[PDB]
Amino acid sequence: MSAFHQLIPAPWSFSAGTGELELDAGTSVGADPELRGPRRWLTRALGGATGWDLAPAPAREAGIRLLLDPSLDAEAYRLEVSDAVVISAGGAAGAFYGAQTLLQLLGPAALRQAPVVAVEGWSVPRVSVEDKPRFGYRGTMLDVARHFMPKDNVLRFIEVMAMHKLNVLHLHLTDDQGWRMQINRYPKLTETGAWRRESSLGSWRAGVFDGRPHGGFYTQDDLREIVAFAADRHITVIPEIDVPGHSQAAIAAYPELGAGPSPVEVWTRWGINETVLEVSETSLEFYRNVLDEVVEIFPSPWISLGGDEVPLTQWQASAQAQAKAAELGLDDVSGLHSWFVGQLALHLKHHGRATSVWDELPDGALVASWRGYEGGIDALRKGYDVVMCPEHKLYLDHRQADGDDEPVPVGFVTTLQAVYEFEPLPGTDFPGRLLGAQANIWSEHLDSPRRVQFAAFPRLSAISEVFWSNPAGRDYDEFLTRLTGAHLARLEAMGVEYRPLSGPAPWQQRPGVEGWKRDYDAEQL
Amino acid sequence: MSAFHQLIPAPWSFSAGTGELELDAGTSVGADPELRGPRRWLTRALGGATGWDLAPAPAREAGIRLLLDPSLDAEAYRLEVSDAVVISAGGAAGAFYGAQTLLQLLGPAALRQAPVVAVEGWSVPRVSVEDKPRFGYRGTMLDVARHFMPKDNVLRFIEVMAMHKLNVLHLHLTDDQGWRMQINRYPKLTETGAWRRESSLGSWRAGVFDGRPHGGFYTQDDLREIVAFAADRHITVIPEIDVPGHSQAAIAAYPELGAGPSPVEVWTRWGINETVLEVSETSLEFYRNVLDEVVEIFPSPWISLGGDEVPLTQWQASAQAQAKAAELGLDDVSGLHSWFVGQLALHLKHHGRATSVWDELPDGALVASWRGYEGGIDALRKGYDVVMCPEHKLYLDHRQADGDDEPVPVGFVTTLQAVYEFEPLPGTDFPGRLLGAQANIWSEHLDSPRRVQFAAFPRLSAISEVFWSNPAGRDYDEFLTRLTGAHLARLEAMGVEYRPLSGPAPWQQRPGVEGWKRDYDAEQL
């Protein structure tokens, strides 16, 4: 039983000792100054689950000790179970991840917000663990533009992320179908842009609508909170304001930003919009003002500008766009795209931030590559930093099985096993560096936080392992036994309603709602 | 500025001193042994909001002291701001409520789950407060049978309740349209009973359906958690399994429990069901087995059996019901109702629990009176303990204003001011005693936790004052200035999307969805 553990993500090295150390209600928590942050989080989480005081004690003297070890990487930790619980780390984030591994060692009741057990004693099996992340950037994107997620649910989603040792949350805040961020200078962004009349029901290709208004937004205080909440859990929040395309919500609010039409209203359907920004000095000024407030709220070194999916139809037919391309000396009207994003990227640079985009900038530019290995290596050749999120691998809005029993089926079949066997560009030594990978959850069809949970899990659990663990020890069948054996119980304890392995629960189904089924091989030939 | 405060519920006595005491990151929390429970909660809540350690110190020696004062009532506290923050209480619950009053004194940022402010210092104005509850039972009912509320949202709703000093949560767990509680002996209750094919859209009188499956359930561990979560906040959770009526979900699961029909399925519409339990030894045994598990999960001295709304049609036409009434020597088939509930009430008594019902038992029987003052005083004459929840006053599923702009309008117009001016039976000295009052939120039309928040607030804030505060100091116009001045900001900080005073936000509206509009005066004559 020496190599046996049920932890996910699996740690890099694990050894079991003999027996169990018992923790009573008197257990105290020590930490070195650098780790006081993680001490607070553990105290709050475990105190809630056990009803214990968990009062601080001098670090070397305590039941649970968090100790600084400068020879370890910052996100790396060592966990030792002895006469005491000793977690060594190179930094706060490391100590935090050690803490998570501890909670898993205590069992699922350690993840509840109030005690569900006796609390006379709990036991931690005696083990030695040594752990570090494989990738430094382990992401998830959350689309709150398509369906607004109430703040309570966002913080809960973030809590579940940290439990999987995911460090990046890419927050897609704006799109054709709504604008979620309150901007003080431009009140209509939320007043007008934060809601739509109705929503496509199923794929936009079925042309049916639900008659139900949808909307909401985060205030600046709400965003601050989310950022602070994530920071306590060592998650970086990268906001995205998507430009020049996916802009109809902003155009509805402030029509000057568009070409022209009857007044433009927040888009009620999915898919790609031919209606986009009119690129010009006024648009530019508008979005510099927006990015001024963004940068005040979000401390993140990257800020995402999107840049995906802009049809040139509007620009080609635009007397203004034509004029603009002449003034700049561009070859054609399509160069305005590169120009517009670059001007904003420059403004971000003025504020000390690198830019993040989906494709195609200053030095620290980060590309999120949804194309395959080729588009990825191509962006490295040019010196851009890369994170992989292939559309045919890592998109979690895509159906989890073949057939008609999955709710609103769209995209490729992307299964638990397929996702677990995924790789990021597997000696060319280029100027660009691979930061890591990210999973994207697009919200068109997920109209409640329950549906988002169904989409994200269990797959995101397997993905968290792909991002964190050692690729050498990878076997799907082995992973399953840990998933079903322990981890599903942890997800249940955290309030996450996932897709059961045998398929959707009857209340998770949505019959009569048309999806769009894609096949990756068919699209190649 | 000596009588001025923005606290809701308003405390019984309040005096402002001069200046502000500043709390730094070194602030420590002391408590007497009885209050260690509330010390833990404050530490968790305020630590989360400030990023402070809030380490324990000897009680008399600490920045925030929670001190036992046996001369105060258990739910009563005194709060003193000085060189230190001193909260005196007669018990844990008292200290808890003092803590809440403290958080309000620090401002809305104290209610966030992560710091949104500088945290260099916070200031508490120097004040003396003396406070007790007017009613000992201050309730809210939550219908999770009609629309299942995910666990994450339930705990958040409970957190918002405790902030208003509400001590009772009446959890309506089962109905025609679903059964939310997992029972180990009877797996189909959840497997079958926990979901329905679709739902009425609007009033059942419009006969239109949404085509959308709905369901979910709490496991026993989930319920335990909710009970423990509530207990940490001094909220009693009274579960309700409604019998003999509102039973079609249980009948779907186990058809023997009904008369007969094509197989019975979970009800898809609202309103009163003619399909009810067949009262008999087998039904009785079934529900004793259910109440055996309930009583293991919920520690509450009361357990609710419902008893509302049973049409006699089925029983009058039932050869079995007729036979049964003969065997017992009842006058007619309608006496089986009283008999069935009484047998279960007896079984509860065996377990040491009093019974709770909606109308019409052993000594500790509690009646929840939805009729007016008359039905209430009548139940006191008979010695039953009473809590008031008049249908024309305290039902929060009812529309908050006249007209067509309120979403799915149903019931009487029940406004913020009307609800704030409400009273419970205003020297007959009967055997029954008035425990308090309760507000009920029926979930037929609230299909998300957002909609539930819209229904419950701001009204539940005014109600919390009616239940807690002194009736002498009651003026609506004064209340408004506190509501708009401070409290709405507190609700925003806790993630609660309420009905704005000027009416529903555009994304809160639901046009095309038929309600049923009632007028209280018209129904009298």
Tokens of A308: 């995906």
Breaks (C-N over 2.5 A) in chain A follow: 261, 360, 426
Look-up of token digits 């529900």: B287
- Residue B376 CA to residue B387 CA, distance in Å, equals 8
Note whether B150 contacts A497, CB cutoff 8 Å.
Answer: yes
Contact B507, A195 (CB under 8 A): yes
We report the CATH number of the domain holding residue A319 as 3.20.20.80
B53/A40 Cβ within 8 A: yes
Nearest to B40 among A53, A214, A493 (CB): A53
Residues whose CB is less than 8 angstroms from the CB of residue B357 and which lie 6 or more positions away in sequence, other chains included = B304, B305, B306, B307, B341, B365, B366, B367, B368
CB contact under 8 A, B507 and A214: yes
b/e code B478-489 from CB counts within 10 Å (16+ = b): ebbebbeebbbb
Q: Which CATH number belongs to the domain containing residue A86 in this structure? A: 3.30.379.10
Asked if the structure places residue A489 within a domain, the reply is: no
B319 CB-near residues (< 8 Å, 6+ apart): none
When CB atoms are compared, the residue of B51, B109, B229 closest to A114 is B229
A interface test, pick of B225, B234, B490 with most A CB neighbours within 10 Å: B225
The answer on A224 and A179 residing in a single domain is: yes
Of B366, B447, B459, B457, residue with least CA distance to B418: B459
Active site residues of A: 309
Instruction: Determine, yes or no, domain membership for B29.
Output: yes
Is A508 inside a domain boundary?
Answer: no
Q: How far is A194 from chain B (nearest CA, A)?
A: 8
C-beta separation of B225 from A112 below 8 A: yes
A227 plus A299 within the same structural domain: yes
Question: How would you class B219 by CB atoms within 10 Å of its CB: exposed for 0-12, middle for 13-18, buried for 19 or more?
Answer: middle
Residues 144-173 of B with CB under 8 A from A: 148, 150-153, 155-156
Domain endpoint, select from A470, A489, A505: A470
Inspect the interface and report whether the beta carbons of A510 and B151 lie closer than 8 Å.
no
- Same-domain status, B198 and B92: no
Pair (B17, B151) in one structural domain:
no
Angle, helices A151-163 vs A220-232, to 10°: value is 20
Domain boundary among B422, B451, B470: B470
Which A positions 198-237 lie with beta carbon below 8 A of chain B?
Answer: 211-216, 219, 221-222, 224-229, 231-232
Q: Which residue has the tokens 């520690």?
A: B299
Of A151, A224, A232, the CB nearest to B495: A151
Under 8 Å between Cβ of B204 and B217 = no
Structure tokens at A294: 């963004």
Parallel, antiparallel, or unpaired: how do β-strands A77-81 and A122-131 relate?
antiparallel
Residues of B annotated as part of the active site = 309
**B116 contacts chain A (CB < 8 A):** yes
> Which are the contacts of B27, defined by CB distance < 8 A and separation ≥ 6?
B52, B54, B63, B64
A vs B, Cβ pairs < 8 A, gives: 132
Say yes or no: A378 and A436 in one domain.
Answer: yes
**Does residue A255 fall inside a structural domain?**
yes
- Distance between B506 CA and the closest CA of chain A, angstroms: 7
Instruction: Kindly tell me the sign of the dihedral angle through the C-alpha atoms of B147, B150, B151, B152.
Output: negative
Structural domain includes residue A488: no
What DSSP string describes A17-60?
A: EEEEEEE-TT--EEE-GGGHHHHHHHHHHHHHHH-----B--GG
Same domain, A307 and A357: yes
Measured torsion, CA atoms of residues B228, B232, B233, B239, in degrees rounded to the nearest 10? 20
Instruction: Tell me if A510 sits within 8 A of A29, measured CB to CB.
Output: no
Which residue from A11, A64, A58, A8 is spatially nearest to A32, judged by alpha carbons?
A58
Touching check for B510 and chain A: CB below 8 Å?
Answer: yes
Q: Assign 3-state DSSP to chain A and report helix, strand, coil percentages, each to 5.
A: 35, 20, 45
- Tokens coding A362: 């200053």
Residues B457 and B331 in one domain: yes
Counted domains in chain A = 2
CA B9 to chain centroid? 17
Place of tokens 């105060």: B72
Strands B178-179 and B174-175: antiparallel
Residue-number span of the structural domain to which B101 is assigned = 2-132
Paired tokens of B470? 């002194």
Closest by CA position to A218, among listed A163, A289, A116, A144? A144
Whether residue A34 is contained in a domain is answered as yes
Residue B119 shares a structural domain with residue B138: no
Contact A57/A64 with Cβ under 8 angstroms? no
Cα(A119)–Cα(A115) distance, integer angstroms: 8
Q: Is A110 in the same domain as A156?
A: no
Resolution of this entry in Å? 2.5
Q: Are A318 and A278 contacting, i.e. CB atoms less than 8 angstroms apart?
A: yes
B407 within some domain? yes
CB contact under 8 A, B213 and A507: yes
Residues A246 and A309 sit within 8 Å (Cβ to Cβ):
yes
What does the angle CA A288 – CA A293 – CA A298 come to, to the nearest 5 degrees? 115
Name residue B268's amino acid: T
Closest chain A C-alpha to B337 CA, distance in angstroms = 33
Tell me which method was used to determine the 3D structure: X-ray
Same domain, A138 and A34: no
Q: Which residue on chain B is closest to A45 by alpha carbon?
A: B44
Task: List the end-to-end C-alpha distance of chain A, in Å, as a whole number.
Answer: 50
Q: Tell me the C-alpha distance between A355 and A361, whole Å.
A: 8
Whether B167 and B62 share a structural domain: no
Length of chain A in terms of residues written: 525
Q: B188: helix, coil or strand?
A: helix
Q: Which residue is associated with the tokens 């007959």?
A: B428
Q: Are A450 and B493 an interchain contact pair (Cβ–Cβ within 8 Å)?
A: no
Contact list in A for residue B216 (CB cut-off 8 A) is 450, 497, 507
Last residue of a domain, one of A470, A492, A507: A470
Residues 6+ apart with CB under 8 A from A503: A401, A405, A406
Judgement on whether residues A15 and A155 belong to the same structural domain of the protein: no
Task: Provide the angle, in degrees to the nearest 10, between the axes of the packed helices A36-50 and A92-106.
Answer: 20
Q: Where are the beta strands (DSSP E) in B229-307?
A: 236-240, 302-306
Return the H-helix or E-strand segment holding A329: none
Decide if A490 is inside a domain: no
CA distance B24 to A427: 54
